[PDB]
Design an enzyme around this catalytic site. Structure first.
Site, mmCIF file in Angstrom:
data_model
loop_
_atom_site.group_PDB
_atom_site.id
_atom_site.type_symbol
_atom_site.label_atom_id
_atom_site.label_comp_id
_atom_site.label_asym_id
_atom_site.label_seq_id
_atom_site.Cartn_x
_atom_site.Cartn_y
_atom_site.Cartn_z
ATOM 1 N N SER A 28 67.883 13.840 32.274
ATOM 2 C CA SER A 28 67.379 13.139 31.180
ATOM 3 C C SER A 28 68.856 12.946 30.758
ATOM 4 C CB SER A 28 66.461 14.059 30.402
ATOM 5 O OG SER A 28 65.215 13.858 30.685
ATOM 6 N N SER A 33 74.220 9.409 30.351
ATOM 7 C CA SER A 33 73.365 8.315 30.416
ATOM 8 C C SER A 33 73.771 7.754 31.901
ATOM 9 C CB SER A 33 73.983 7.141 29.554
ATOM 10 O OG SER A 33 73.853 7.691 28.251
ATOM 11 N N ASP A 162 81.994 17.519 37.553
ATOM 12 C CA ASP A 162 81.985 17.969 36.233
ATOM 13 C C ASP A 162 81.134 17.226 35.429
ATOM 14 O OD1 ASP A 162 82.448 19.377 33.945
ATOM 15 O OD2 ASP A 162 84.557 19.586 34.047
#
Ligand SMILES: Nc1c(C(=O)NCc2ccc(C(=O)NCCCC3CCCCC3)cc2)cnn1-c1ccccc1
Ligand code: NA
Length: 334
Positions: A28, A33, A162
């Site tokens: 999500s 994004s 990361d």
């Protein structure tokens, strides 16, 4: 320059080369994004990350630059790599959006760990250490290694990433507070915490806060000895340590009961309180625990990485221009 197409996905606008098709949000906000996509150039699934407000402030702009520099550096099997970086902008003045393209990874180690078999632990920790030898050789420190930053395909091939699982759970005590003295082996501490959790199915040090975290850590590894206490320059740190009732190092054999004794011996070498004494990634690869996988001719080091920019205090448009330079100079892997 390629032909781009526009769509809106879960509240975000996406302007990408036609090369990338079938965009589908993943996670999500877990990853940012990010969309799964089909790369028509290669016929492979990829992930496309659109950076969020990349040049909104000086600090965002420098973070954006830093992420792109690190990604463009990484050329190793066990580290995420950059397949593509693009902007819909035709010029620096138009430049406002940065997309990064990587391999699509299958699952993180958080969404895998139940126990694993000792053989699967050997292979996964081996690959983490192989990746760490590589980034450590470039004087890069991960500093936030934890299961959610490790991705593994169905084939058990692992990559270090990361995206940024409480960070504090996996964090070396020397950088829990007052982060003025540490080395690459902060990441080796994190690997020890991860390996313990793969072997046992349980978080090794599930601290509720930084003070509970140090209490859990010292319970296993014991309170600092005389030799380590002589190296603590912070008076506050020293007063905290020396106000604790003394605690012996546990015998790790009595904690990781039933584990491969070689796994226990490697954990003892990774979860050493004194970071001067903690095993390095290069050393750990030569540990008998990895006899099945260690190949000293196939554990490569990295090209040098110029991190001189980290010390620089520049304006937003300067970080922006440097970032633009890096987009333009990008050469895709063959
Ligand atoms: N969510 C994603 C992506 C993704 O977001 N790609 C995009 C992506 C972009 C950047 C990073 C990243 O690491 N920036 C820091 C780079 C430098 C560090 C590298 C490490 C050493 C220390 C410096 C990561 C990913 C790909 N696979 N999955 C995925 C995973 C599991 C399940 C489902 C899907
Ligand atoms: Na950490």
């Amino acid at each position: 320059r390629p032909t781009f197409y526009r769509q809106e996905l879960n509240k975000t606008i996406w302007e990408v080369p036609e090369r990338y098709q079938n965009l589908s949000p993943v996670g999500s906000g877990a990853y940012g994004s990010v969309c799964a996509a089909f790369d028509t150039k290669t016929g492979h699934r990829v992930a496309v990350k659109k950076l969020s407000r990349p040049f909104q402030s000086i600090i965002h702009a420098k973070r954006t630059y830093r992420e792109l520099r690190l990604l463009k550096h990484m050329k190793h099997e066990n580290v995420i790599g950059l397949l593509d970086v693009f902007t819909p902008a035709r010029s620096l003045e138009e430049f406002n959006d940065v997309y990064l393209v990587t391999h699509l990874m299958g699952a993180d180690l958080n969404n895998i760990v139940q126990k694993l078999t000792d053989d699967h632990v050997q292979f996964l920790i081996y690959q983490i250490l192989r990746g760490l030898k590589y980034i450590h050789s470039a004087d890069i420190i991960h500093r936030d290694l934890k299961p959610s930053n490790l991705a593994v395909n169905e084939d058990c091939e692992l990559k270090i990433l990361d995206f940024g699982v409480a960070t504090r759970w996996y964090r070396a005590p020397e950088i829990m507070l007052n982060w003025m003295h540490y080395n690459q082996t902060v990441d080796i501490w994190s690997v020890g915490c991860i390996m313990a959790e793969l072997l046992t199915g349980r978080t090794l040090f599930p601290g509720t806060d930084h003070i509970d975290q140090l209490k859990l850590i010292l319970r296993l590894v014991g309170t600092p000895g005389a030799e380590l206490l002589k190296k603590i320059s912070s008076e506050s740190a020293r007063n905290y340590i020396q106000s604790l009732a003394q605690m012996p190092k546990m015998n790790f054999a009595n904690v990781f009961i039933g584990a491969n004794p070689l796994a226990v011996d490697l954990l003892e070498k990774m979860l050493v309180l004194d970071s001067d004494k903690r095993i390095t990634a290069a050393q750990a690869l030569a540990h008998a625990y990895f006899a099945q996988y260690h190949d000293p001719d196939d554990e490569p080091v990295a090209d040098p990485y110029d991190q001189s920019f980290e010390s620089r205090d520049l304006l937003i448009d300067e970080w922006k221009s440097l970032t633009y330079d890096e987009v333009i100079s990008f050469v895709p892997p063959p």
